[PDB]
Amino acid sequence: GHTGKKLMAQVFFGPTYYQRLRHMVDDKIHARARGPVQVLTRQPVEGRSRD
DNA sequence: GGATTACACCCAAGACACCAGGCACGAGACAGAAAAAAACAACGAAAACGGCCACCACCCAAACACACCAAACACAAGA
């Protein structure tokens, strides 16, 4: 694509049925600097949804 | 007999006690226990009948002797 030159090797090419799985990165990316702590231990809480 | 059996992360879903016999008080009845009296043991006082010493006579015990029997050294017999 960059140069239009032929590729020295030939490429196995054709349609294939792919699937969109439920695991998206935007549902997983989590960061925490400081946030809510637990009542008993005063340590950071557990959960991406709970920060 | 107990005790331990990978590590990290994501999401969703339900419950966050209800209801029934024991403690206190709440009052009777035989049993847990207390009070009394009458038939239980003994002792004081009188009555007369059983117990002890006499008197007494007939039945059992001892002496005498009888004849009778059991028995024991030894002169004789015997192997």
PDB file of C-alpha atoms (C1' of nucleotides) in Angstrom:
ATOM      1  CA  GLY A   1       0.000   0.000   0.000  1.00  0.00           C
ATOM      2  CA  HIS A   2       2.832   2.419   0.769  1.00  0.00           C
ATOM      3  CA  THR A   3       4.733   1.925  -2.501  1.00  0.00           C
ATOM      4  CA  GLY A   4       2.539   0.008  -4.949  1.00  0.00           C
ATOM      5  CA  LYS A   5       5.413  -2.433  -5.445  1.00  0.00           C
ATOM      6  CA  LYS A   6       4.468  -6.091  -5.648  1.00  0.00           C
ATOM      7  CA  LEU A   7       5.004  -8.223  -2.582  1.00  0.00           C
ATOM      8  CA  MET A   8       7.670 -10.855  -3.160  1.00  0.00           C
ATOM      9  CA  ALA A   9       5.401 -13.454  -1.524  1.00  0.00           C
ATOM     10  CA  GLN A  10       1.782 -14.177  -2.384  1.00  0.00           C
ATOM     11  CA  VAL A  11      -0.909 -13.794   0.249  1.00  0.00           C
ATOM     12  CA  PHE A  12      -3.675 -16.188   1.294  1.00  0.00           C
ATOM     13  CA  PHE A  13      -6.714 -14.010   0.725  1.00  0.00           C
ATOM     14  CA  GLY A  14     -10.479 -14.365   1.028  1.00  0.00           C
ATOM     15  CA  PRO A  15     -13.586 -13.979   3.181  1.00  0.00           C
ATOM     16  CA  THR A  16     -13.840 -15.474   6.669  1.00  0.00           C
ATOM     17  CA  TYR A  17     -16.634 -15.244   9.243  1.00  0.00           C
ATOM     18  CA  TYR A  18     -15.490 -13.261  12.285  1.00  0.00           C
ATOM     19  CA  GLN A  19     -17.242 -12.510  15.576  1.00  0.00           C
ATOM     20  CA  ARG A  20     -17.451  -9.383  17.750  1.00  0.00           C
ATOM     21  CA  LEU A  21     -16.884 -10.581  21.302  1.00  0.00           C
ATOM     22  CA  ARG A  22     -18.280  -8.859  24.391  1.00  0.00           C
ATOM     23  CA  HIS A  23     -14.847  -7.887  25.758  1.00  0.00           C
ATOM     24  CA  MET A  24     -14.103  -4.260  24.857  1.00  0.00           C
ATOM     25  CA  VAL A  25     -11.101  -2.379  26.217  1.00  0.00           C
ATOM     26  CA  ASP A  26     -13.219   0.613  27.270  1.00  0.00           C
ATOM     27  CA  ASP A  27     -15.077  -1.667  29.709  1.00  0.00           C
ATOM     28  CA  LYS A  28     -11.784  -2.737  31.295  1.00  0.00           C
ATOM     29  CA  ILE A  29      -9.463   0.271  31.411  1.00  0.00           C
ATOM     30  CA  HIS A  30      -9.240   1.443  35.013  1.00  0.00           C
ATOM     31  CA  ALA A  31      -6.918   3.769  36.901  1.00  0.00           C
ATOM     32  CA  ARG A  32      -6.970   5.012  40.488  1.00  0.00           C
ATOM     33  CA  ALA A  33      -4.859   7.705  42.141  1.00  0.00           C
ATOM     34  CA  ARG A  34      -6.826   8.015  45.394  1.00  0.00           C
ATOM     35  CA  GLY A  35     -10.412   7.133  46.174  1.00  0.00           C
ATOM     36  CA  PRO A  36     -12.873   5.492  48.547  1.00  0.00           C
ATOM     37  CA  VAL A  37     -11.562   3.078  51.166  1.00  0.00           C
ATOM     38  CA  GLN A  38     -13.152   0.248  53.111  1.00  0.00           C
ATOM     39  CA  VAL A  39     -14.753   1.005  56.465  1.00  0.00           C
ATOM     40  CA  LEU A  40     -13.103  -1.827  58.396  1.00  0.00           C
ATOM     41  CA  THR A  41      -9.566  -1.999  56.990  1.00  0.00           C
ATOM     42  CA  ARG A  42      -9.308   1.542  55.516  1.00  0.00           C
ATOM     43  CA  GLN A  43      -7.735  -0.003  52.411  1.00  0.00           C
ATOM     44  CA  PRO A  44      -8.806   0.743  48.820  1.00  0.00           C
ATOM     45  CA  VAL A  45     -12.174  -0.747  47.876  1.00  0.00           C
ATOM     46  CA  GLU A  46     -12.565  -3.574  45.348  1.00  0.00           C
ATOM     47  CA  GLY A  47     -14.019  -2.941  41.912  1.00  0.00           C
ATOM     48  CA  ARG A  48     -13.621  -1.027  38.673  1.00  0.00           C
ATOM     49  CA  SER A  49     -17.196   0.239  39.050  1.00  0.00           C
ATOM     50  CA  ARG A  50     -16.503   1.326  42.648  1.00  0.00           C
ATOM     51  CA  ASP A  51     -13.237   3.127  41.728  1.00  0.00           C
TER      52      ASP A  51
ATOM     53  C1'  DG B   1     -10.690 -36.360  65.916  1.00  0.00           C
ATOM     54  C1'  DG B   2      -8.920 -31.692  62.360  1.00  0.00           C
ATOM     55  C1'  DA B   3      -6.558 -29.046  58.165  1.00  0.00           C
ATOM     56  C1'  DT B   4      -5.143 -27.578  53.683  1.00  0.00           C
ATOM     57  C1'  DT B   5      -6.361 -27.667  48.261  1.00  0.00           C
ATOM     58  C1'  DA B   6      -3.298 -21.322  42.261  1.00  0.00           C
ATOM     59  C1'  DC B   7      -2.995 -15.935  41.140  1.00  0.00           C
ATOM     60  C1'  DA B   8      -5.106 -11.469  39.166  1.00  0.00           C
ATOM     61  C1'  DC B   9      -9.458  -9.173  36.942  1.00  0.00           C
ATOM     62  C1'  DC B  10     -14.851  -8.413  35.008  1.00  0.00           C
ATOM     63  C1'  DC B  11     -20.131  -8.725  35.380  1.00  0.00           C
ATOM     64  C1'  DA B  12     -25.033  -9.862  37.339  1.00  0.00           C
ATOM     65  C1'  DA B  13     -28.693 -11.156  41.209  1.00  0.00           C
ATOM     66  C1'  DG B  14     -31.091 -11.536  46.046  1.00  0.00           C
ATOM     67  C1'  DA B  15     -31.509 -10.291  51.165  1.00  0.00           C
ATOM     68  C1'  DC B  16     -30.251  -6.802  54.669  1.00  0.00           C
ATOM     69  C1'  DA B  17     -34.870 -12.755  60.296  1.00  0.00           C
ATOM     70  C1'  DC B  18     -40.658 -13.248  61.895  1.00  0.00           C
ATOM     71  C1'  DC B  19     -43.233 -15.784  65.385  1.00  0.00           C
ATOM     72  C1'  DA B  20     -43.751 -18.775  68.812  1.00  0.00           C
ATOM     73  C1'  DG B  21     -42.950 -21.083  73.926  1.00  0.00           C
ATOM     74  C1'  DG B  22     -40.297 -19.540  78.295  1.00  0.00           C
ATOM     75  C1'  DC B  23     -39.760 -15.734  82.915  1.00  0.00           C
ATOM     76  C1'  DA B  24     -42.817 -13.304  86.083  1.00  0.00           C
ATOM     77  C1'  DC B  25     -46.288 -13.418  88.202  1.00  0.00           C
ATOM     78  C1'  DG B  26     -50.796 -15.815  88.669  1.00  0.00           C
ATOM     79  C1'  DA B  27     -53.698 -18.999  91.483  1.00  0.00           C
ATOM     80  C1'  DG B  28     -54.912 -24.750  93.396  1.00  0.00           C
ATOM     81  C1'  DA B  29     -52.937 -29.855  95.881  1.00  0.00           C
ATOM     82  C1'  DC B  30     -50.345 -33.757  97.703  1.00  0.00           C
ATOM     83  C1'  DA B  31     -46.255 -33.993  98.631  1.00  0.00           C
ATOM     84  C1'  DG B  32     -41.789 -31.945 101.401  1.00  0.00           C
ATOM     85  C1'  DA B  33     -42.228 -31.441 105.803  1.00  0.00           C
ATOM     86  C1'  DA B  34     -44.266 -30.179 110.966  1.00  0.00           C
ATOM     87  C1'  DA B  35     -47.744 -31.047 115.317  1.00  0.00           C
ATOM     88  C1'  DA B  36     -50.338 -34.336 118.167  1.00  0.00           C
ATOM     89  C1'  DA B  37     -52.355 -38.515 120.647  1.00  0.00           C
ATOM     90  C1'  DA B  38     -53.339 -43.409 121.762  1.00  0.00           C
ATOM     91  C1'  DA B  39     -52.103 -47.876 121.997  1.00  0.00           C
ATOM     92  C1'  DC B  40     -47.160 -49.199 122.617  1.00  0.00           C
ATOM     93  C1'  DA B  41     -43.049 -50.473 126.601  1.00  0.00           C
ATOM     94  C1'  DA B  42     -42.047 -50.088 131.525  1.00  0.00           C
ATOM     95  C1'  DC B  43     -43.016 -49.682 136.728  1.00  0.00           C
ATOM     96  C1'  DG B  44     -45.887 -49.147 141.840  1.00  0.00           C
ATOM     97  C1'  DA B  45     -49.719 -51.756 144.774  1.00  0.00           C
ATOM     98  C1'  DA B  46     -52.906 -55.838 146.135  1.00  0.00           C
ATOM     99  C1'  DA B  47     -54.191 -61.415 145.922  1.00  0.00           C
ATOM    100  C1'  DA B  48     -53.855 -65.739 146.352  1.00  0.00           C
ATOM    101  C1'  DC B  49     -51.833 -69.817 144.514  1.00  0.00           C
ATOM    102  C1'  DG B  50     -47.502 -72.293 143.380  1.00  0.00           C
ATOM    103  C1'  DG B  51     -43.149 -73.478 145.886  1.00  0.00           C
ATOM    104  C1'  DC B  52     -40.327 -75.509 150.066  1.00  0.00           C
ATOM    105  C1'  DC B  53     -39.904 -78.527 154.304  1.00  0.00           C
ATOM    106  C1'  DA B  54     -42.517 -82.502 156.811  1.00  0.00           C
ATOM    107  C1'  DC B  55     -44.484 -86.813 156.859  1.00  0.00           C
ATOM    108  C1'  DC B  56     -44.590 -90.674 155.101  1.00  0.00           C
ATOM    109  C1'  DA B  57     -44.871 -95.918 152.700  1.00  0.00           C
ATOM    110  C1'  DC B  58     -44.000 -99.058 149.066  1.00  0.00           C
ATOM    111  C1'  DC B  59     -40.534-100.085 145.201  1.00  0.00           C
ATOM    112  C1'  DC B  60     -35.788-100.316 143.557  1.00  0.00           C
ATOM    113  C1'  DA B  61     -30.785-101.149 145.024  1.00  0.00           C
ATOM    114  C1'  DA B  62     -27.096-103.848 147.488  1.00  0.00           C
ATOM    115  C1'  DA B  63     -25.291-108.325 149.897  1.00  0.00           C
ATOM    116  C1'  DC B  64     -25.224-113.391 150.193  1.00  0.00           C
ATOM    117  C1'  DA B  65     -25.026-117.301 147.936  1.00  0.00           C
ATOM    118  C1'  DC B  66     -26.237-120.720 144.323  1.00  0.00           C
ATOM    119  C1'  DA B  67     -24.939-123.132 139.708  1.00  0.00           C
ATOM    120  C1'  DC B  68     -23.156-121.789 135.165  1.00  0.00           C
ATOM    121  C1'  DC B  69     -20.142-120.246 131.873  1.00  0.00           C
ATOM    122  C1'  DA B  70     -15.971-117.877 129.680  1.00  0.00           C
ATOM    123  C1'  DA B  71     -11.242-118.407 129.852  1.00  0.00           C
ATOM    124  C1'  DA B  72      -5.964-119.304 130.449  1.00  0.00           C
ATOM    125  C1'  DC B  73      -0.885-121.987 131.321  1.00  0.00           C
ATOM    126  C1'  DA B  74       0.675-126.359 130.023  1.00  0.00           C
ATOM    127  C1'  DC B  75       1.056-132.035 129.420  1.00  0.00           C
ATOM    128  C1'  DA B  76       0.163-134.107 126.097  1.00  0.00           C
ATOM    129  C1'  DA B  77      -0.450-134.925 121.346  1.00  0.00           C
ATOM    130  C1'  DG B  78       0.868-133.669 116.685  1.00  0.00           C
ATOM    131  C1'  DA B  79       3.910-131.886 111.471  1.00  0.00           C
TER     132       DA B  79
END
